[PDB]
Design a protein around this nucleic acid. Structure first.
Ligand SMILES: [K+]
Ligand SMILES: [K+]
Ligand SMILES: [K+]
Ligand SMILES: [K+]
Ligand SMILES: [K+]
Ligand SMILES: [Mg+2]
Ligand SMILES: [Mg+2]
Ligand SMILES: [Mg+2]
Ligand SMILES: [Mg+2]
Ligand SMILES: [Mg+2]
Ligand SMILES: [Mg+2]
Ligand SMILES: [Mg+2]
Ligand SMILES: [Mg+2]
Ligand SMILES: [Mg+2]
Ligand SMILES: [Mg+2]
Ligand SMILES: [Mg+2]
Ligand SMILES: [Mg+2]
Ligand SMILES: [Mg+2]
Ligand SMILES: [Mg+2]
Ligand SMILES: [Mg+2]
Ligand SMILES: [Mg+2]
Ligand SMILES: [Mg+2]
Ligand SMILES: [Mg+2]
Ligand SMILES: [Mg+2]
Ligand SMILES: [Mg+2]
Ligand SMILES: [Mg+2]
Ligand SMILES: [Mg+2]
Ligand SMILES: [Mg+2]
Ligand SMILES: [Mg+2]
Ligand SMILES: [Mg+2]
Ligand SMILES: [Mg+2]
Ligand SMILES: [Mg+2]
Ligand SMILES: [Mg+2]
Ligand SMILES: [Mg+2]
Ligand SMILES: [Mg+2]
Ligand SMILES: [Mg+2]
Ligand SMILES: [Zn+2]
Lengths: 60, 105, 134, 86, 52, 135, 122, 50
RNA sequence: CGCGACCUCAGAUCAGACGUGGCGACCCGCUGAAUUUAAGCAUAUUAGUCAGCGGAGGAGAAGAAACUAACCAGGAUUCCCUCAGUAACGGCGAGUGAACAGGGAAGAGCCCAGCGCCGAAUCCCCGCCCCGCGGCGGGGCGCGGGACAUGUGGCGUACGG
RNA sequence: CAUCUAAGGCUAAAUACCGGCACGAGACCGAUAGUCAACAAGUACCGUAAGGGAAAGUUGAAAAGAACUUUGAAGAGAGAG
RNA sequence: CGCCGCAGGUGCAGAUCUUGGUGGUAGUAGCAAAUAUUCAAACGAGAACUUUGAAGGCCGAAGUGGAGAAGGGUUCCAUGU
RNA sequence: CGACUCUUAGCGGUGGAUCACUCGGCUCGUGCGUCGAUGAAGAACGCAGCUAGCUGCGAGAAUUAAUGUGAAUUGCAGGACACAUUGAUCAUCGACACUUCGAACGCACUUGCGGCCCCGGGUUCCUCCCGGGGCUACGCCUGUCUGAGCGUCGCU
């Protein structure tokens, strides 16, 4: 789960997460929060685990 | 209403005069500002006369003032011809010239 | 008296310039006299107060000959804090008591390259004035 | 009943926020702002409301460009120059 | 603002106020009555050399 | 002429103002022609205009325009005046020959209404109360 | 260990972009630490890195703009952002050359009848 | 309503973030002269402009 | 019966430029009331004012007589004092109402078209080189384009040429 | 008889300035006054809208803004400072 | 602040006066439209009103039920006060 | 005797008059007298470690650079900062940058949808998808190119 720029679309979120975390993602679901920020649910590819990626990202 | 003897007065204050009132609180400042300009102009034309070009002798027009002589706008072209001054050189040496004045006498 | 037509003597304006002054001229406002020895050693009278110079309070409750090092120049409140110029509060801790820099004399200057430049700057101007009015 | 009962039927907005001036005077059905007259090129302004003029006149907003012009005017609008390198 | 703040005083009036003011300044009783402490002044039409 | 643009010819007021027809515009048709040429060509400067023919329902005029930013105009003195900012939209301020004729300007006893440069200037001067400091 | 503008100007585009990238990954890490609590030391470094990013970017933009001005110097047509922006009214007025040139009639009058310096005795 | 435009939703977002109590440390600032958020808005008392 | 010249038109995300909108105290061009006064009221007054529309600049407008005068003549414009609450206008009621001369502030004059003469003498644009950059100019070069005799430039404009 | 020469053009100064930038001053007002606005004021708030539109200054030299004890669930008190 | 002069936005009981504050009325009118509550326990300083259980009732599917449009805009959900 | 009521006084409440103060106005005067397609005024949305308003600022966002200055900012924290292998803060401000609407400019908006030319990636050149960059408003001037006319002609 990420907080992203409101002007970024699903394609841009997909590329952004791919290069600066070196992971492959399956799909991106997007909503705009009531506070105005955009939230992205980025589902990783089956061969990637979201737990160790979050561990090395630092959001455990 | 009229009250006893008096002068029939006709003031011209029916036309919203208060929106067009010219006060003179800048009169002392205006006199100072023109005097600075006069002094600055005199310095700019350092040896030339401060007042400006020489002006001709002129008799006042009407029967009220025709005994009185004043200064005119500029010397006539006939005046310059018999004085031997070119009408285009005179303005360069401080002689004012009025092309539209004729000499009846 | 004042003759310059571009500097104001209006009380509201002078107070407004003083309390809304930027910190870089609040430094000049927060100047202090030097001691007689320092005023004789350098040909200067006053000096903007500095972080690590040591002064004695000459007015108020904390008057005395004890020399205290300045520990804070808190320009927003136009006060300086000195080492032992402090009081106890209710719960037993100590709080510095801010006093105006005009009510101290500097007994010793925190000297760096910039102060020395300012010190000879002021002295040279004073010497020019002395030889102008000789 | 013209009073309380009729007030229960108001649920359709006549006006919306206006893309120019940002006021809630854009008539949806007329497609015109009642405050600035947005689709018109020129701003709606009338001398019979001096109080309305002062509300939205120059200086009531940010004046991003004009503040710099006032500062730049004091040096003759100099350009292509820098303070002398230290 | 157009309250007529100024007054014009005839020049002969004004010159005659100056003359009265000057004549009163040479009488000790009047200068003392203004409270000017002219106790030890040598002479009230008091004149000093041009050196001043 | 100029019909007063009121609904159903109703000029609500005193009878002296009831006129709807036989009313006349203050400026000539030539001035209107210059105004329309200038407004459409906002980047040009109206110089003058002349008459090229009239019908019972139309008058035809030809207006001389100048491009103030062309180098042939911009580099030539005696045409550089039209390039100054004070000379933009002359036809809308009555500064052309056709627009000037309606202003009542002139010299002498027939044109006392415009001493000062315009009817406003004369009216303001003649209707301003000079309250001197000393009265 | 901070970065200054002076020592950035000698560097070339490759390492300036490299320097900018390292700051961006550090700021993103600092933003992660802000969300997960982190520490006051890491929170206060957010502003330091942000101004460092601004510092690098302004040097890149200034260097690029300076080169473009040099490239277009002497050319008849220049990009609008490289042309002077005095004032819309000031950019429309006559330049110095056409402001002072005169007709042959005008300069003949000045040559023939120049203004003379004179004085008059009382 | 549930059906809303992006501009309306963005407008509601800003009105929501600025309807919060003032931080406590503000009163400690020198020359504060602020006691509480006087622009607090409740959804039931006063309605938004739109 | 096709190819050319010109004329009058058209298109282009053509090369390079310009206008739009804001402010609007002061200024210019229009449009333009009624309250009010007249002890009613319609002409009149309010007022060429409020409101309305357009256009500018640091000022604007005006401006170098198709003037004022009737004198022993003055001499562009603008502003001040006065003329003058006057001449005059007006249900000649209420009310309205300048100008010339005089004294000052300032002071500055000029340019075309036309009529003519001069081998279009003229102007714009594009390339090349040099001096420069500081708002982009100067010089030289081009059997380089265009404008222009349906008239560019120099001389010259009532003070005569 | 006098006077000028229309139906083309330009032109500085003296003049204007309740908007703007930056200043100076005052026999003015002094928080129901003076700008509506001395203060997070064209703000809060009202009206669909055009538009309408407030109230609200002062601890102390310095927070030294009442530690601690005690009753009460607390507000709030009694001591102390 | 007195005295000599100077100058006013210079004297209040009224104007169904303006703004602000405060009384009597008065612990009064009143907190009465749509049948209805009761027992025990828990938490809690404190229970007619909270929660749980038990009982008695009501809406009675054209609902006091379950979901939407318009409108509202975070009122949604937890925890705490 | 008490209650109650009334008058007066002391004290205490309620209330905010009075007085003193004034980083505000009002008035007068002075010098300048400067907006915008190189995107104005205005509006919206964002930007602080803790930050709602005000203020400032624009994705480089309570500010970058530069210059002056010379040790702070400050409510708290944090970390700088030899002040010389250059510097806190503040001021100035000439370099750079400056989101979306708005004259507002590809078309349209209480929404959304295009077209053209380059670059990168999946392609592994051929053009489909994704991303990035630059263009695409109206009027008008000079010039250019492409044209139209049973307009006027010339030659065949
Ligand atoms: K009417
Ligand atoms: K009369
Ligand atoms: K030719
Ligand atoms: K008020
Ligand atoms: K206000
Ligand atoms: Mg979705
Ligand atoms: Mg009704
Ligand atoms: Mg009438
Ligand atoms: Mg000629
Ligand atoms: Mg409601
Ligand atoms: Mg009547
Ligand atoms: Mg009557
Ligand atoms: Mg009547
Ligand atoms: Mg008007
Ligand atoms: Mg305009
Ligand atoms: Mg002019
Ligand atoms: Mg003129
Ligand atoms: Mg003439
Ligand atoms: Mg008389
Ligand atoms: Mg009249
Ligand atoms: Mg004179
Ligand atoms: Mg010729
Ligand atoms: Mg008030
Ligand atoms: Mg008071
Ligand atoms: Mg309580
Ligand atoms: Mg009174
Ligand atoms: Mg009373
Ligand atoms: Mg009861
Ligand atoms: Mg009851
Ligand atoms: Mg039942
Ligand atoms: Mg239901
Ligand atoms: Mg709930
Ligand atoms: Mg009491
Ligand atoms: Mg810096
Ligand atoms: Mg649709
Ligand atoms: Mg043909
Ligand atoms: Zn609008």
């Amino acid at each position: 789960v990420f907080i992203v720029d409101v002007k970024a679309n699903k394609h841009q979120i997909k590329q952004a997460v791919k290069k600066l975390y070196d992971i492959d993602v399956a799909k991106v679901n997007t909503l705009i929060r009531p506070d105005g920020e955009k939230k992205a649910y980025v589902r990783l590819a089956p061969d990637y685990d979201a737990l160790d990626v979050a561990n090395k990202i630092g959001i455990i | 209403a009229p009250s006893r003897n008096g002068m029939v007065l006709k003031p011209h204050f029916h036309k919203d005069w208060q929106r067009r009132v010219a006060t003179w609180f800048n009169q002392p400042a205006r006199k100072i500002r023109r005097r600075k300009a006069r002094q600055a102009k005199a310095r700019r034309i350092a040896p030339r006369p401060a007042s400006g070009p020489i002006r001709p002798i002129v008799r006042c027009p009407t029967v009220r003032y025709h005994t009185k002589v004043r200064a005119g706008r500029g010397f006539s072209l006939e005046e310059l011809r018999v004085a031997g001054i070119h009408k285009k050189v005179a303005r360069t040496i401080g002689i004012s010239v009025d092309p539209r004045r004729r000499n009846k006498s | 008296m004042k003759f310059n037509p571009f500097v104001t003597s209006d009380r509201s304006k002078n107070r407004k310039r003083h309390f809304n002054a930027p910190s870089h001229i609040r430094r000049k406002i927060m100047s202090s006299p030097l001691s007689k020895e320092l005023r004789q050693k350098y040909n200067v009278r006053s000096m903007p107060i500095r972080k690590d110079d040591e002064v004695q309070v000459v007015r108020g409750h904390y008057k005395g000959q004890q020399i205290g090092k300045v520990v804070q120049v808190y320009r927003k409140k136009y006060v300086i804090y000195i080492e032992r110029v402090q009081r106890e509060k209710a719960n037993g801790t100590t709080v510095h008591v801010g006093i105006h820099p005009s009510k101290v004399v500097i007994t010793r200057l925190k000297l760096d390259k910039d102060r020395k430049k300012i010190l000879e700057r002021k002295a040279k101007s004073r010497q020019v004035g002395k030889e102008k009015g000789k | 009943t013209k009073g309380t009962s009729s007030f229960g039927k108001r649920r359709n907005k006549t006006h919306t926020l206006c893309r120019r001036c940002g006021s809630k005077a854009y008539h949806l059905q007329k497609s015109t702002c009642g405050k600035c007259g947005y689709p018109a090129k020129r701003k709606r302004k009338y001398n019979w409301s001096a109080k309305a003029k002062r509300r939205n006149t120059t200086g009531t907003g940010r004046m991003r460009h004009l503040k710099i012009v006032y500062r730049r005017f004091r040096h003759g609008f100099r350009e292509g120059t820098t303070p002398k390198p230290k | 603002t157009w309250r007529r703040w100024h007054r014009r005083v005839n020049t002969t009036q004004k010159r005659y106020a100056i003359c009265s003011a000057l004549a009163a300044s040479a009488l000790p009783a009047l200068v003392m009555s203004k409270g000017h402490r002219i106790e030890e002044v040598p002479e009230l039409p008091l004149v000093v050399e041009d050196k001043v | 002429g100029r019909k007063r643009p009121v609904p159903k010819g109703a000029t609500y007021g005193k009878p002296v103002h009831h006129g709807v027809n036989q009313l006349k515009f203050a400026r000539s048709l030539q001035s209107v022609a210059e105004e329309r040429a200038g407004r459409h060509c906002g980047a040009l400067r109206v110089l003058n205009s002349y008459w090229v023919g009239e019908d019972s329902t139309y008058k035809f005029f030809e207006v001389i325009l100048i491009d103030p930013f062309h180098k042939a105009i911009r580099r030539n003195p005696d045409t550089q005046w039209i390039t100054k900012p004070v000379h933009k939209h002359r036809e809308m301020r009555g500064l052309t020959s056709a627009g000037r004729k309606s202003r009542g300007l002139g010299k002498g006893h027939k044109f006392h209404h415009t001493i000062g440069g315009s009817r406003r200037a004369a009216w303001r001067r003649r209707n301003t109360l000079q309250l001197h400091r000393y009265r | 260990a901070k970065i200054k503008a002076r020592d950035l100007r000698g560097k070339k585009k490759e390492e300036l972009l490299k320097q900018l990238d390292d700051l961006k990954v550090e700021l993103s890490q600092l933003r992660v630490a802000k969300v997960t609590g982190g520490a006051a030391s890491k929170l206060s470094k957010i502003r330091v890195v942000r101004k460092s990013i601004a510092r690098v970017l302004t040097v890149i933009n200034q260097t690029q703009k300076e080169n473009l001005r040099k490239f277009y110097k002497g050319k008849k047509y220049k990009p609008l952002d490289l042309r002077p922006k005095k004032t819309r009214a000031m950019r429309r007025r006559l330049n110095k050359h056409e402001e002072n040139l005169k007709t042959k009639k005008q300069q003949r009058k000045e040559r023939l009848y120049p203004l003379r310096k004179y004085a008059v005795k009382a | 309503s549930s059906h809303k435009t992006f501009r309306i939703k963005r407008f509601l977002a800003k009105k929501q973030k600025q309807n919060r109590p003032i931080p406590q440390w503000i009163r400690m600032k020198t020359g504060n002269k602020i006691r509480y958020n006087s622009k607090r808005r409740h959804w039931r008392r006063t309605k938004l402009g739109l």
